[PDB]
Design an enzyme around this catalytic site. Structure first.
Site, PDB file in Angstrom:
ATOM      1  N   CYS A 133      -0.195   3.107  -4.318  1.00  0.00           N
ATOM      2  CA  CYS A 133      -0.988   4.453  -4.640  1.00  0.00           C
ATOM      3  C   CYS A 133      -0.149   5.801  -4.560  1.00  0.00           C
ATOM      4  CB  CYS A 133      -2.105   4.440  -3.385  1.00  0.00           C
ATOM      5  SG  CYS A 133      -2.957   3.185  -3.164  1.00  0.00           S
ATOM      6  N   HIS A 144       0.861  -1.207   0.122  1.00  0.00           N
ATOM      7  CA  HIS A 144       0.078  -0.275   0.233  1.00  0.00           C
ATOM      8  C   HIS A 144       1.038   1.277  -0.145  1.00  0.00           C
ATOM      9  CE1 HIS A 144      -3.894  -1.728   0.417  1.00  0.00           C
ATOM     10  NE2 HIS A 144      -3.682  -2.511   1.310  1.00  0.00           N
TER      11      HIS A 144
END
Lengths: 429, 428
Positions: free
Chosen positions: B166, B124
């Protein structure tokens, strides 16, 4: 040969229940094309779908992925809060005076006439949902059918039912010799299915973030739509709908049940539905009614822009929905454990009577204890009525209204805040 | 002539069965390199290792990174697992400092001046930050500093960095300079999102019974590409263009612009210089932050209507969405306090021009995140999406005490939840 009547009922509201009012509209068009006249078809729909803010095609409703509109042309006999039990009974009995609101259209039938009733929504054991409170209960329904037969104001009557635990509506209540033939999307214990849903690759909808129809409903309508209904009979359709609904291998599914005078099922379909001049002779199942409400909220949230207010509203919709049903499940269980103890609690609540038996002996007790439960634990909504067998068994166990009042008081104490828990529209009983 | 040896560092910065895809990417990447020529002793692997033997794993002791793919968990060394997967060990490994290591196998990139290094990260992330299964999180500046510090040692010829996260661009945009002999590609720019692939809800080739995503688009793209070609024929630039196009939007849709940074001239090199090659010679709709939720939803949806499993999944959906709602409101409210109703969102949501660094003071960023978490609870790997908000706050000249007070006002009481727990430490 009398005239052919019809009563079409969607017992639900909200865009997440798009499919139910879509079913009724489809059914209406199906019957008009068959020969039935608009003045003989009474339509109950909340009518909050065609011009819903969420509808990608305003002013229209479709009942299949590549289907055409079926909303235009449908009479608005009973819409909004006029969709209630009293008006429903009034229409069936053919009482103009008993009507309150609406177009005033009723079933002023004669002894040679044929009647066809079709319901699609939500339901639980011994109860069918309505967009207005209180809900429709099996005993009241069968009493009216009994009250209708006594008038002798119809030759034969067919009843198609789409709901969760549908069999419970007629099992133990609907007797033979009334010239009524009822079929249901499920028995008194298994589930009804939404079809043409988002995510469901078995024929999904392109921009609709909600289910377009219901399996059992879609099955008999699409069947009746493509055939010459002079060749096909009720029994044949019952078998055909049974098959299209029945489980594959070990996958989930539902038994399409039939009740009443099976002899009536010898009749051709055109005796009730008429027939379309096009003469021919004679897919999902991964989402039940209760989860079909949630797939809308999820799909709405999932497809929404990552920073929009739409994603936030949808997020809250998923939150309040799942929070409500989590509260209800625990509350029913908790009340059970409270009444009978930790051991006997789930035993009583989850006990299922043998097929053919009525759900509850005292239906007034059922309503009362539902009302007692809701007064403290908040409304069940159209989801919470799944626990209606638990309340039935509590009554069958000989529990008194004051005991439930007390158990509910101890189980919830405070009324839960939420749009689903609101009692502002009335009790579910 | 293969002057020197080839090294590799594989890192999965996430844990939990909902993050199955990340450790799956790393395991696949490992098998890809072993068959390429790289030796086990030259490949350092960071994985929490809570997937293969997971309660939710339909095929216990195995991990797959594609629908019809084979198991890639076998043979993979457990160099750094569990709480050993932390920033300090990662830097020690990169720098080749055996003494700086704490726990784990002790394997590090003890490289030489002719060696080639290949780093691959998948998890992430948010603007200017990459997630770790432990606290604290990996910040862009510290990562660039260790890369800088590595170059100063002159202990490698060239280094390649593949990043899946991200707003991946933010990790190198404005920090990663030229002349370090480093070439990095990112799954997205500093503003858009990364994608999981092979997810249940995703109609394009879903997993058979798995209720979680098997891999990530950018990651799966280069690994599957390097697995079928001769890596002596293909170059870094050619693969970059290949992954760019596969990841890119199809049209009127959405994807991710694959970016490249550092010394572009290095991209002329062949892939086998870093990845080696397999003797077989051939010539040449779900983002990360929702991917965690599609698991909970699918788990709930496919569970029996009365099961305790359905209830557990239901609660997971509740606490997951309740958490992110709380974080979102908290972040916004803090801004409103500091800058007023109008200017709040304006200041926090402002995006700097591409090429610019996320924040001028990275210590301020760390400190203020800690201040926020002390009152509003942990951000989790979701909340780090709001890192640009914190960055802009620092850039706006907001002081430590102001953040501390604004946080205490916005978050009077510590929120109850497994995601907002401070038991494992601060995200900064």
């Amino acid at each position: 040969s009398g005239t052919r009547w019809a009563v079409l009922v969607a017992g639900s509201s909200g865009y997440w229940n798009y499919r139910h009012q879509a079913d009724i509209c489809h059914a209406y068009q199906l019957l008009r094309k068959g020969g039935l006249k608009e003045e003989n078809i009474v339509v109950f729909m909340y009518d909050d779908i065609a011009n819903n803010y969420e509808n990608p095609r305003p002013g229209t409703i479709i009942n299949s992925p590549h289907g055409k509109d079926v909303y235009q042309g449908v009479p608005k006999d009973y819409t909004g809060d006029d969709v209630n039990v009293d008006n429903l009974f009034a229409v069936i009995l053919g009482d103009k005076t008993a009507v309150k609101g609406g177009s005033g259209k009723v079933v002023d039938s004669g002894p040679n006439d044929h009647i066809f009733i079709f319901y699609s929504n939500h339901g639980g054991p011994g109860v069918l949902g309505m967009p207005t409170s209180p809900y429709l209960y099996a005993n009241d329904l069968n009493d009216v059918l009994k009250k209708k037969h006594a008038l002798g104001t119809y030759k034969s009557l067919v009843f198609y039912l789409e709901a969760c635990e549908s069999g419970s509506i007629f099992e133990g209540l609907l007797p033979e010799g009334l010239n009524i033939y009822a079929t249901t999307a499920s028995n008194a214990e298994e589930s009804s299915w939404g079809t043409y849903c988002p995510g469901e690759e078995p024929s999904p909808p392109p921009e609709y973030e909600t289910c377009l129809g219901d399996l059992y409903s879609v099955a008999w309508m699409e069947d009746s739509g493509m055939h010459n209904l002079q060749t096909e009979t009720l029994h044949q359709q019952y078998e055909l709908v049974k098959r299209r609904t029945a489980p594959v291998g070990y996958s989930y599914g539902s038994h399409v049940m039939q009740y009443g005078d099976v002899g009536i099922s010898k009749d051709n379909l055109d005796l009730y539905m008429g027939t379309n001049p096009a003469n021919d002779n004679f897919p999902s199942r991964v989402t039940n009614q209760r989860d079909a409400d949630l797939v809308h909220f999820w799909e709405k949230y999932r497809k929404a822009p990552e920073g929009s207010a739409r994603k936030t509203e949808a997020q809250k919709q998923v939150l309040e929905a799942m929070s409500h049903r989590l509260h209800i499940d625990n509350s029913v269980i908790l009340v059970g454990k409270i009444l009978f103890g930790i051991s006997r609690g789930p035993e009583v609540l989850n006990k299922v009577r043998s097929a053919g038996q009525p759900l509850v002996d005292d239906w007034n007790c059922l309503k009362n204890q539902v009302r007692a439960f809701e007064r403290h634990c908040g409304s069940l909504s159209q989801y919470g009525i799944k626990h209606m067998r638990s309340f039935a068994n509590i009554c069958n166990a000989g529990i008194q209204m004051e005991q439930m009042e007390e158990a509910a008081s101890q189980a919830c104490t405070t009324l839960p805040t939420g749009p689903w828990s609101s009692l502002n529209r009335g009790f579910s009983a």
